[PDB]
């Protein structure tokens, strides 16, 4: 379980795995943990499925409703709250092995500069939560990985063509560098699923695109 | 770690994956495990590195020390009997957490029929043996799928090539089926390796025959 | 604590931070954890310096014994089954809480090929060795880090001093990415330090030019 | 983690450092631990930042919330009782290991000697508070060397620039004794962050200033 | 119980404090804690006495009898070697509480430099040594204390009469940072133990200067 | 901590020390522990400061609100019996760890005798009550010393005076037996406070009186 | 079990109670702690009879074998040495339970002033020896009343009756002061036993002596 | 701690001892333990003094109560049913350490024979109850000691005078055979107390008809 | 299990009961637990049978040995030695629990006073021996009753006769207050067996004179 997430100017992208291991057998190769919450957010979650589907449902009703009763969106620091009190109210059963931490990556309407209204938060175990300004933040197992060649390759990084490209190899490296993180799959046409926000909204990447910057860069490898 | 071994007409084949984990991080991506001990036979080893090639290391040793002490090489009832006291021995540190299961496959040329001469050997943790009869044995993580691929896929065993086929195809489905045994690499160029066993000797596989039939098996599959 | 050790055409470089921290705290700012055994070849331990200067110091001193004794150096296998002994001798020890892990890396004069004559060896906890040939590799608590940024900057590695600058980015990284590693001083003068071993046998890096590269690092990632 | 705070005639003057490390990794480079409640008194918690970051906005909710209710601002004694009991209501979750130990700093305006009106207040694990009156106190992992720096530094305070200094001076002596205190960061741009309280209210000191004394006293230390 | 040494060009001097304590209740006013090994060299060790003095004397003993027996003084890395054996073969009596750290500090008369020649050595738990290059070195219970107040006293010593100054003036604020480090005893008159090792030898400070120093110190803060 | 209180003629008197420690480190210097809770009464609490300020200040609320509601002081039995349900109440917290001992010492206006007016009781961990008859009685961690001290020293109490110097005698004999007592501080001046009880009521003693003792007492024991 | 020794011009004393206890239950009332290992010195141990008459009964037989052996006897410092090793010796069965303190004095015959030959050397747990120099020191249960009584008797030991009076004087206040301590007995006329070495020898103080001292500060006592 | 009592003709008697022991250190001196709660009867409670006060108050108290509500005392059944639910009611107390066993003694003035109208009644830790008929019950640490001492000397008791002679000598003998009972004091005056009930009611011995008695006792036994 | 022994004036007694109990079921009515070992002494072992026999036989044993081979009887005090060493050559068995207590009662041929010749000694669990010197001793279960029947009725102990009576007295007064412990049996005719130990020699009372005795003291108890 790997997912990435990346600052480009104008916008944010959102990327992550599709794969599910019950110890050390496969049980699923092309599950979904990228989900839109509402029009100008994304989250996704990395941990117990069971408990990740869970929190997705809950914070798009829990932002659905506060919308229909007040009239209104929520601002980007009561929903930033909120997930925060939905991740804290779970640490007993994260405690118990029920863990699951969630990234938020959105964008920000009520911001002076389109071009730097993308917004990444991290949440830890405890619910803190932090504001990523690094310009990327990853989670899961091979967070690390995926990391260091983000931190390699944000040099790259112009528009949303550069930073979905950049996130496909950082969560290729990851899969190369951790055995619980599914590559992609040129047999079955498995590929990963990323979400991209930008002014207009966000909207769902096609996968064919995906797949033929998996396959550019399995050929640029090879 | 996966290591199968079947047996064909006028001989019997062997292979394993290529693949260390150290939990669930990948750290060998080209590991070798089936080896030679001497003319007739060859030995493969699932489990703790450091012991398996002590363990292979050990006994070819042994072996050669009989052989040049007595002047004939041991039978193989003497050999079964050697590489079974050898794991016995070792129970204590299997219990730690030190666990070698070695895998036993060789020629008799004391057989009446050479046709029928091949044996398989498979050793459990308390160090008792029993004799494969059935055509087919797998040892490792991933043993289960193998083996079933191999009772499905057995009835098209003829000859040498045949066999060989069957056992990349079946390490294919184990490493499908498992995240801890590591499948052909199309990119690196890793393939599995194999020896051959039969009465002119033990040969290792050349890589190109294993390239081509896993590349074929990976076209069939697509 | 982390150590380096990647290969370029012609030899092997080998490099190590120079900081010991009790707990959280600072204990050591320049201490030495690279050594070199004798002509041909040079080790690095990461973990308990008590342990880590005895197993050098050991080492060293076993190997000149042999070559006293037989008149002859041992192979470059005898000098990895030494120290894979040593190594396992002391896994108590290391169950127990000290644990030292070392990496070695030589150059073979008894290879056809001059310049792939560089060998890098890694070994384990429980004495399990393995030859590298990635390139590169690190060991330590910041290994992961450093491995990485490997990845991505052993394609401008073509002689000894690209691969030194790679060597020492690699340890400014690890040392970014982790509080235990210690980087560059640029107040005290403290620095990596830094063996190059090739045909003309193993030398130490001098200070001035370990110096010069950290400082255009510094000022290139500003 | 490390927040300092000492007195200087007619205010006094409170700073932290902004790195935050999840065991031995580090997690955050600018992470803000000093926060302003009210006009007259800023507070600097130490420990984990889900907890801290709750205590302070509940401590400025609380505050506010009473001087809305009752018209005027409570005293200082009313506020260090708020907050002790604050403090004691989480020792539980302390004793779990959600630990957060706050310090106070504030303004008396209520004071006979405008020159003494700063107040400097420790807490307990156990909410237990003592008024600081040797003109310094720290918190956090390196408080033992930051509270020796001012001790040995203290003779030297005669106004806010002063003071200033001298709390920089500490914060970097404590971050170059201890591995998990950030230091100032002349590649990032990353300084710590200082808050003045007076007579006129509480005022955050720019990064300017911050940066210009901190590049003066790594200038005098090399 | 604080013992701390540092460097003044042309020799070294070493002290330590006068205190006992079985718990939180004062057993002794005067303990001695430095002792002279042998000529060029003294040692300080702290924590249980019935191990301080037995060290002491084994030390004394083991080197005292290698002259005798080769007719020539050991070297200075082999009076290391020793006590760090020495060390390290009390680490199952330290684990159970029986734990002794000893300080090393002497005079290299085969050194180019005379100036340069004085040497400070530290010991760890496990027997691991490091040589002293900072100029300063403390041991003990309040180390940190000791250690900090030299890190901002060091500036001033340019003779042994300073550096004997600066080591009373730091044990004097770890006794009034430590309620377990016994200060000056102006009513009995009890004063700490100095040792100056120098290019003539190793002597025994008058316990008048002692005094006088003391006396001043206490003055100067008051 | 110590915290002694005797009986003389005429009135009763009662002082305690101003040092506290966490552990084995000085956190306090000027610590005050003896409060005077109404007219003609003062209680001193050693143990847990968190426990001792809120037992003190609930104790005075409870009796200011019981003389406000009755219109008439509470009697000494009274008075008795809400301390010690008081202390009774907190069973559980100390056997935690949050131990509190208070003493009580007090005179009664409804006795026939004025001279003999005076009252002294001590309170156990599980809320029992004793009326102290011996002349004095010493709380603490060195109560055992100061109560010896004041064995010996009681015949010398002839007045409020003699009183107070016995007093300050047993605190500073308490002092030098226990490493936990703070001594009268000669180059801080910060010396112990003390509580004067009579016909008149309870008064504060001034620390000009109780520095003359000490000095006094200081030169005495030269 | 309470033995106290202190030091006189021209000697020393030694005397211990006389009541042996099992638990709470009393065993023995003359029980005899206070033996006479040789010509000048004499010893008394606190805790377990069965092992303390064990350790008067060798001591004694090994000074005389060593005496008899060399033909001169052993140096004070020998004779202390030889008791810290039986002392030590018996750690293991001192943590089952099995604990004995010894306390030795005696007189040192090879000193250049008679008056100050008195020597008092008490033992620790682990094997630990001090030289008694505040002239006086107790060991047992009730030894810390006893050494405060001797604290404020000191000052009255002019001669040998002195000496002996403040020893019992100190015993009884412990006695008083202590459950497990016998005082001297009127009814059955038990009274502790003394010892008294000086130039001559040392001698058993008769029991008439010792009931007048017991009978004349009882009565000053009432 | 022991308490004592006897039936003799026309009557009964009741007393105990006055020392109170924190484990093995004396902390109370006269110590009462003997208590009336109404005019025909008087309680003793044995242990914890905190549980025995509160005991008899509140037993008092209940007696107290349903007296003034129905406007007739209690029957001496009633009185013990309310003591054995009182004693059930602390059984956790008791478990955890607070035990208390009180012992009951009274008049029953609706008997036909006055001369055989005294009871004592003895209770258990669990509440059980049992009414005392061979004359004499003891209870307490000491309990065995003074029931053989009243099993011997109870054929002399034929009045008032005669049991409080017998009660006083098996206290002494309790005190003399157990460290935890107090016997009585010729130097500060203390002598146990006793409570005498008759057909007149229960009233208090005076402390001089006791102090002869004791007298004596102690003059016989010499 | 009781044995008793008290000292007359020419002589010594010695005698014990006749019950041995498995738990709370009786096994035996008539077990001997009282032996002669040789002309002048008697021991009686309490505790476990299969040790006390087996206790009994090697001191007779060992005894014997030693008159043979050196032709002269142990002194009192060696056979004491003996016993104390054999008793504490069994503490690992007795904690496991194996416990046996033995009582030892002798005649000492080599006094001054025939009259007082008489011994009797006790030995602890640890072994530790002392002399019995008020009279009187008594062992096992019931041994504090049957102590205290002796301390009341040791005054009518003038001859032989008169201290079997009391020793008789005695061991029925234990046996009516411990239940397990066996009186005298008038159905069975089992009566206590005891043995007097004079200057002629030690006799076996004859079970007529016991069995009067014990007929008499139950008339007068009737």
Redesign the interface.
């Known amino acids: 379980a790997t997912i990435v997430a990346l600052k480009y100017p104008g916008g944010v992208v959102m990327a992550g795995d599709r794969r599910s ?1 019950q110890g ?3 049980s699923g190769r092309d599950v979904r943990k990228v989900y839109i919450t509402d029009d100008y957010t994304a989250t996704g979650i990395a941990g117990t499925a069971a408990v990740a589907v869970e929190f997705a449902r809950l914070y798009a009703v829990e932002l659905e409703h506060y919308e229909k009763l007040e009239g209104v969106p929520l601002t980007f620091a009561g929903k930033i709250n909120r997930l925060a009190i939905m991740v ?1 109210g779970n640490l007993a059963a994260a405690m118990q092995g029920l863990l699951a931490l969630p990234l938020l990556a959105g964008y920000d309407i009520h911001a002076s500069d389109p071009q730097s209204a993308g917004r990444i938060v991290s949440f ?1 175990a ?3 939560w ?1 504001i990523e ?1 690094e310009g990327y933040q990853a989670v899961g ?1 091979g967070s ?2 995926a990391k ?2 983000m ?2 390759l944000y040099s790259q990084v112009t528009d949303g063509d550069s930073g979905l490209r950049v996130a496909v190899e950082a969560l290729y ?1 990851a899969a ?5 993180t599914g590559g992609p799959d ?2 079955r046409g498995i590929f990963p699923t990323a979400v991209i926000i930008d002014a207009d909204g966000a909207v769902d990447v096609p996968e064919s695109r995906i797949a033929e910057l998996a396959r550019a860069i ?1 050929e640029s ?2």
């Not at 190369?176 to 619980?180: P, R």
């Open positions: 291991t050390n057998m496969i804290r830890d405890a619910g803190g932090n300004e197992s690390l990985f260091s060649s931190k390699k490296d190369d560098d951790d055995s619980a040129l047999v399995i490898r090879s």
